[PDB]
Amino acid sequence: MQEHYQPAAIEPAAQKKWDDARISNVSEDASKPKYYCLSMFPYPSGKLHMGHVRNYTIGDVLSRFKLLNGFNVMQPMGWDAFGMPAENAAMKNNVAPAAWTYDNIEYMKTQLKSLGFAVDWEREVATCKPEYYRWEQWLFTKLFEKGIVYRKNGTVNWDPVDQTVLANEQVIDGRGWRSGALIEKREIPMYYFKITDYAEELLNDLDKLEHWPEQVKTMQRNWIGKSRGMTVRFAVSDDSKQGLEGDYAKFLQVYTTRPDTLMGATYVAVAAEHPLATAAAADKPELQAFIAECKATMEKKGVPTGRYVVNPLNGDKLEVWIANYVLWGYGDGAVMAVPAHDERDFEFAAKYNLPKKQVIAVGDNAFDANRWQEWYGDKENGVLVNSGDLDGLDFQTAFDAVAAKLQSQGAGEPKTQYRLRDWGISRQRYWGCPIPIVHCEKCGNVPVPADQLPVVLPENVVPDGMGSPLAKMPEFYETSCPCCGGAAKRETDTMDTFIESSWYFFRYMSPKFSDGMVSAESAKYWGAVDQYIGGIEHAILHLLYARFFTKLMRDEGLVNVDEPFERLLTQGMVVCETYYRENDKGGKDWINPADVELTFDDKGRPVSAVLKADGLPVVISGTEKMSKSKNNGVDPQELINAYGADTARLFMMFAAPPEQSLEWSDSGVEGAHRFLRRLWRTVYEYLKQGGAVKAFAGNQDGLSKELKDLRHKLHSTTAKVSDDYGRRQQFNTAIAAVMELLNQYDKTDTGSEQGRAVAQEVLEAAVRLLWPIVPHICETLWSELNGAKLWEAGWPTVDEAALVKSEIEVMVQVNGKLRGKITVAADASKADLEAAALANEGAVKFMEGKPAKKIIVVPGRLVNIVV
Ligand SMILES: Nc1ncnc2c1ncn2[C@@H]1O[C@H](COP(=O)(O)OP(=O)(O)OP(=O)(O)O)[C@@H](O)[C@H]1O
Ligand SMILES: CC(C)C[C@H](N)CO
Ligand SMILES: [Mg+2]
Numbered sequence: 001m002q003e004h005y006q007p008a009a010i011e012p013a014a015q016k017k018w019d020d021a022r023i024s025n026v027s028e029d030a031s032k033p034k035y036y037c038l039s040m041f042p043y044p045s046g047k048l049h050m051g052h053v054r055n056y057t058i059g060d061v062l063s064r065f066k067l068l069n070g071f072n073v074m075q076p077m078g079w080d081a082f083g084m085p086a087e088n089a090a091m092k093n094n095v096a097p098a099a100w101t102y103d104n105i106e107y108m109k110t111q112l113k114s115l116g117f118a119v120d121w122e123r124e125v126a127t128c129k130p131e132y133y134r135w136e137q138w139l140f141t142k143l144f145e146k147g148i149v150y151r152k153n154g155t156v157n158w159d160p161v162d163q164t165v166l167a168n169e170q171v172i173d174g175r176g177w178r179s180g181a182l183i184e185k186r187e188i189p190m191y192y193f194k195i196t197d198y199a200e201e202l203l204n205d206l207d208k209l210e211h212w213p214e215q216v217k218t219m220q221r222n223w224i225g226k227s228r229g230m231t232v233r234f235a236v237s238d239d240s241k242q243g244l245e246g247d248y249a250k251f252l253q254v255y256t257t258r259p260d261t262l263m264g265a266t267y268v269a270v271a272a273e274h275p276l277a278t279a280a281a282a283d284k285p286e287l288q289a290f291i292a293e294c295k296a297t298m299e300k301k302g303v304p305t306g307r308y309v310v311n312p313l314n315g316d317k318l319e320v321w322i323a324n325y326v327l328w329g330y331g332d333g334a335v336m337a338v339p340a341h342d343e344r345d346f347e348f349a350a351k352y353n354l355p356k357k358q359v360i361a362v363g364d365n366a367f368d369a370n371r372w373q374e375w376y377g378d379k380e381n382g383v384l385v386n387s388g389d390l391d392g393l394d395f396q397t398a399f400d401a402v403a404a405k406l407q408s409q410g411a412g413e414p415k416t417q418y419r420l421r422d423w424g425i426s427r428q429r430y431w432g433c434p435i436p437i438v439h440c441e442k443c444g445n446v447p448v449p450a451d452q453l454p455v456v457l458p459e460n461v462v463p464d465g466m467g468s469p470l471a472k473m474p475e476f477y478e479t480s481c482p483c484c485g486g487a488a489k490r491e492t493d494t495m496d497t498f499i500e501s502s503w504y505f506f507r508y509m510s511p512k513f514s515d516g517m518v519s520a521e522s523a524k525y526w527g528a529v530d531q532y533i534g535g536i537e538h539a540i541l542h543l544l545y546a547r548f549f550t551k552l553m554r555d556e557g558l559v560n561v562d563e564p565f566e567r568l569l570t571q572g573m574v575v576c577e578t579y580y581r582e583n584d585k586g587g588k589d590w591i592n593p594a595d596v597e598l599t600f601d602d603k604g605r606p607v608s609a610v611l612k613a614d615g616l617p618v619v620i621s622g623t624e625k626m627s628k629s630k631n632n633g634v635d636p637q638e639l640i641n642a643y644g645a646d647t648a649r650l651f652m653m654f655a656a657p658p659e660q661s662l663e664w665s666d667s668g669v670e671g672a673h674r675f676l677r678r679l680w681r682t683v684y685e686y687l688k689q690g691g692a693v694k695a696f697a698g699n700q701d702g703l704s705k706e707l708k709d710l711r712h713k714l715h716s717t718t719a720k721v722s723d724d725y726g727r728r729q730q731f732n733t734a735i736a737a738v739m740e741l742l743n744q745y746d747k748t749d750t751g752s753e754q755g756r757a758v759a760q761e762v763l764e765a766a767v768r769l770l771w772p773i774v775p776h777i778c779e780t781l782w783s784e785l786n787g788a789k790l791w792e793a794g795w796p797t798v799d800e801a802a803l804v805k806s807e808i809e810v811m812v813q814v815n816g817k818l819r820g821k822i823t824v825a826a827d828a829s830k831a832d833l834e835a836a837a838l839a840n841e842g843a844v845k846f847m848e849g850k851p852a853k854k855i856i857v858v859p860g861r862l863v864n865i866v867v
C-alpha cells in the first residue's frame, strides 16, 4: 500500500475492476429480488454540473446499498435528447441539433463514467433515435384511432421567443418554461392527449402514493382541480315561453358547486348569446343593446328580462337577468345567484338591488344583509337554515340531500368538473419526434400504418430561426396517402419532449426490444420503479404526464402496474452565484462565475463584477439553482481532476440532508478531501504496524473494557448507518456516524493481539459502510485489508452481543440482613457502589433514618451499611 492517497491511480483501476466484473449489468434474474432505482435522466443542454452529482450520487448510494444487501439492482442512465432543451442549446452554440446532441451525450457519458456510478450502460437509451421514438409514434397512432389522441383548433398558449405552442404545464408564471418570455394566446390547431378522460383516476390514485412527498400530491390535486357540483334545471314559467327552442322552452339549465344554497337562489343570470336572451330581445332593442355591448376583473353589468323560471326545490319564481359575467361556451351558459353566500353575487345584487335570502348559519355569527362577511361563504362549518327539510344539515349532507331531491323530480343530478385541460403536445419545432399523421384532402388526417413506422426525422437540418423547418422541406412532407394512395402531406409539427420523458422508465426494462414499447416478460419482472430521484420542479411537469402514460400503456395491455414510481425522493438544489448580460436580442447571456472577477466593498459586499476576458461589467444576479441553461455550473470533471471523484461525491452527501438546499463552497470540498485522506492514512498506519489479521468475531468475554466499548460503538454505527440508508435516506448523518466511530478508534489502544483483531473488524466495517458513498477508495482499502471481493462480503451485520452494556449486580445489606439489590457499572469505584447502596429504597427503609456508622464494601460482591 502506498502512503499517499492518489485518486488518479485508484479510481480508474477500481472502475475497470467493476466493469470487468459486470456487477452493474443485470438481467431478469428470478433468484434475486429486484430493485429498480432511477434518477431523472438529463437533457443534453450543456455540461453536467455538481447539482447532477448530488442527484445521481443519491441514486448510486441507494443502489450500492441494495446491491450489498443481495438485490438485483437496475440503475440505468440515458438521454432526454429530443425537444426544446437540446435544440435551444444547439442553436445558442451555433451547432445543428443532431450533431450538438450526440456530442453532448458523449461528454455527459464521460462525466458520469468518471464519477463511478454503478450504471447498467447496456441499457443506455437515447430518445432521439428511431429505435426509441418509433414506439411513441406507434402508441400515438393507436390512441389517435380510439380518439384518445385528437386534433382540434382552439385557443392555445403561444411562445413568441421559442416560436412554438406550449402545453398548459409548460406555462410558468405566464412565461414559457425555457424562454421566460410572456406567453400569448393564439388560435392554432394542435394534437391533444385526452388526459381529462383519466382525471378521476389520476386524482384518486394519489392516495396510493404513501412514499411520495405530500407536496407533490397536493400540487397535482390542485392542478387537476376536481370540482364536485350540481346541474340544476329551473322550469320556464308558463308566462315566459315566448320563443320555444326545444328544451330551452321547458327549462333553464345551470351548474353550481353550492347546491346546499339552492333554497337561497333569489334570481338567475344568463348570457347574451343564450336563447333566453335571444327570445327576451325579439321585441327589445334595449335588450340587444346589452347583447351587442357584451358581445374576472371587469365590473359586472346586468339587465332584467321579464322572463321567469321556477326554483324546483321550493317553487319560487326567479327573474332571469342578462349578465356580463356569463360566457356561452362554459357549460349551459347560465347560472343561478345566491347573493347571501357568494361574494360575486352579493355585489351584483347590491348594485341592482336584488334580494338576499340567508340560508347558511355558522355558529355564533349574526347575519347582516347589506354587509358581506367571509363566513357567509364558509364551505366547512356552516349549517343550513330556511331550507325546508334541509335545515340543520352541513355542506356534505346537504349536497346529497339536494341531489336526492332534484333526482326524484328529474330536475338535477351531480356533475364533476376539473380545472385540468387536455394535453397539447404538437410543436412547431424541428428537433422532436415526427407526428405519424398524413393529411389527405380526401381521407382527412390519417395515421401512418404500423408497418411504415417510424416516420424518420431527417438529422442533417440546421434550423434557420424562422418557424418550423419541416414545413419548408417538401422532400419530407410530400408523400402519398396511406389509404387512397394519392398525393398527401405529412404533419410537420413534432412532439414535445415530455412525450419521451413519459415512458423512458419502461423502455429501460428492455431497451433493445424491437416488437413493442417494452417486452412483456421484462415488464412483469421489473414491475414499477422502486425508487425515483429528481427535483421538485417535476411535480406537475413530467410526474403528472408519466402517471398518465403508465395508465395509457396499462389499458393497452403493455404493463400491469397502475403507478410507475413507488418511492420518490426530491433532492434539494445545489445553489451558487449567477451572472449574465443582456444581449442585443433582448435575451440574457449567462456567464459562469469562473470567468468573472468581482469587486468588493469595505464590509465585504460584492459591488462590481466584470468579465475577465474583456474587463467589461456583468450583472450580479445572486445565488440560484445550479443550471446547465444558466451557465452557472461547476463541472464535476474539474473537481475530479483536482481532488478525485470520491471527494466530489462525499462533499455532496455530507454537506446537507438530501432534501435541503446546499450552497456551493470550496471549503466544503477541502473538508471532504481531508476526511478521505484521514481514512487512507488510518488504514495505512494500521497495516504498517503488523499487517492484516482475521477480524474479531464471536463471543467477546475476556476483551478489555476499552475494546468492548469500541465494538459497542462499531455495531451501534452499523445499526445507525443501516437505518440512515434504508429507512431514513439521510446520507450526511451516515457519514457523521462513521467519523464518530473513527474518532473513538483513534482514542483506543489497539496495539495488542486482541486489539489488532478489533481494529481489523472496525476498519473492515467502516470501508463497507462508506462504500456506497465513496466506492473507489473503499474498494482499494478493502483489498488492502481483506483478500475477498467486497460486493460478496455483503452489508455488515450488527452483532447484538456487542451492544449489551457491561454491568454488575451488587447486594446491599443493613445490619447484615440482606435488604436490597442494585445494579451499577463494572468500572464503578468503591464510592459509587457506596452512593448507589444508600439510594436503594430497601436500605433507606431498613436504615430508618439513622446515619450509617460504616459501610463494608466487598470488591464487586456486597455493600454492608452498618446502621
Ligand atoms: N442544482 C441542482 N441541484 C440538484 N439537482 C439538480 C440541480 N440541477 C438539476 N438537477 C437535477 O438534475 C436532473 C437533470 O436535470 P436537467 O437535465 O434539467 O439539468 P439542469 O441543470 O436543470 O439543466 P437545464 O438548465 O437545461 O434545465 C433533474 O432531476 C434535476 O432536478
Ligand atoms: C424525466 C425528465 C422529464 C427529466 C428532465 N430531462 C430533466 O429535468
Ligand atoms: Mg402499499
Ligand SMILES: [Mg+2]
Residues within 6 Å of the ligand: none
Ligand atoms: Mg432542468
Ligand SMILES: [Zn+2]
Residues within 6 Å of the ligand: 440, 441, 442, 443, 444, 481, 482, 483, 484, 485, 486
Ligand atoms: Zn387518401
